[PDB]
Design a protein around this ligand. Structure first.
Ligand SMILES: Nc1ccc(CNC(=O)[C@@H]2CCCN2C(=O)[C@H](N)Cc2ccccc2)cn1
Ligand SMILES: *[C@@H]1O[C@H](CO)[C@@H](O)[C@H](O)[C@H]1NC(C)=O
Ligand code: NA
Ligand code: NA
Lengths: 251, 10, 28
């Protein structure tokens, strides 16, 4: 996260770290959506241009974390993966269309002050909240600058941007399965997700019921925090029928 | 670098 | 989950984090 700040303790209790077993390193962010299911970006698991194709046994999920590098004894919980599910129409060839994946844990994780699931939006919450100017919150342990790495989880609040402005900011083909967020050059304020924040959540706190909903997944950007560029996020609601199909079939 | 995690998690 | 999106250290104890108001103010 570029131009963000340290998270408060328990601020994002759905935050998940995807962790490579060997070598031991951060792979991505992710989010907890139930006691057995974690949501992330498909490119965190499968990206052939970079020879990335992880299997279940390659990976761990670390839940309840705040420090990036510490083993947070008695706080974090570490889970093994039973199965990965990647969207069948995930477009790794071109533009990361449908950049979404689910991971089922081998065993349920115990909730705590530090570990708690985020809600997924329904149609009405998404329609109400996914509006230009409305701000969401992005969190992660990724790079602090485009060109180091944080001691603890970083957070930044960013406004959703009008679709024509998103489209006009890039040569990449944008789809309805994406939205973009970030400040415009004339708005002064700054901030973006960056490499290493992939797969983490873009959340919004509904003013109707005071619950946090995950509207997006960190997907892509061209550089990080560049003037005139925006961060692109997987549109969770648009892909929720697939999420529900996987959980209903394999839960 | 990352602090080693308990071996039980492999 | 019926309890989703309600944080133990914030919503569950009626405490606000330091920047959630910025989100609320943007929801016009
Ligand atoms: N500001 C940022 C920057 C990076 C990230 C994390 N995500 C990635 O790094 C992804 C994974 C695949 C490549 N990539 C990129 O984002 C490429 N820079 C653009 C691209 C976009 C689409 C297709 C190919 C390429 C989030 N926020
Ligand atoms: C990725 O890995 C699996 C094997 O573990 C393989 O079946 C698949 O063809 C690989 N490449 C993809 C999905 O592009
Ligand atoms: Na209300
Ligand atoms: Na920007």
């Amino acid at each position: 996260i570029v131009e963000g700040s340290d998270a408060e303790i328990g601020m994002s209790p759905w935050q998940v770290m995807l962790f490579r077993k060997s070598p031991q390193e951060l792979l991505c962010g992710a989010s907890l959506i139930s006691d057995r299911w974690v949501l992330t970006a498909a490119h965190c698991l499968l990206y052939p241009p970079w020879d990335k194709n992880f299997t279940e046994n390659d990976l761990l999920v670390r839940i309840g974390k705040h420090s990036r590098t510490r083993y947070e004894r008695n706080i974090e919980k570490i889970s093994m993966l039973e199965k990965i599910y990647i969207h069948p129409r995930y477009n790794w060839r071109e533009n990361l269309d449908r950049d979404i994946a689910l991971m089922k844990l081998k065993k349920p994780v115990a909730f705590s002050d530090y570990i708690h699931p985020v809600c997924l939006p329904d149609r009405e919450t998404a329609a109400s909240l996914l509006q230009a100017g409305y701000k969401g919150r992005v969190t992660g342990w990724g790079n602090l600058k485009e060109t180091g790495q944080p001691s603890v989880l970083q957070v930044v609040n960013l406004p959703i941007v009008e679709r024509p402005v998103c489209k006009d900011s890039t040569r990449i083909r944008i789809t309805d399965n994406m939205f973009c967020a970030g400040y415009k050059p004339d708005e002064g304020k700054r901030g973006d997700a960056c490499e290493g924040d992939s797969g983490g959540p873009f959340v919004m706190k509904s003013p109707f019921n005071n619950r946090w909903y995950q509207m997006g997944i960190v997907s892509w950007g061209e550089g990080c925090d560049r003037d005139g560029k925006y961060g692109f996020y997987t549109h969770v609601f648009r892909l929720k029928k697939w999420i529900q199909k996987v959980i209903d079939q394999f839960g | 670098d990352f602090e080693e995690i308990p071996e039980e998690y492999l | 989950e019926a309890d989703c999106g309600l944080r133990p250290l914030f919503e569950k104890k009626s405490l606000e984090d330091k920047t959630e108001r910025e989100l609320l103010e943007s929801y016009i």
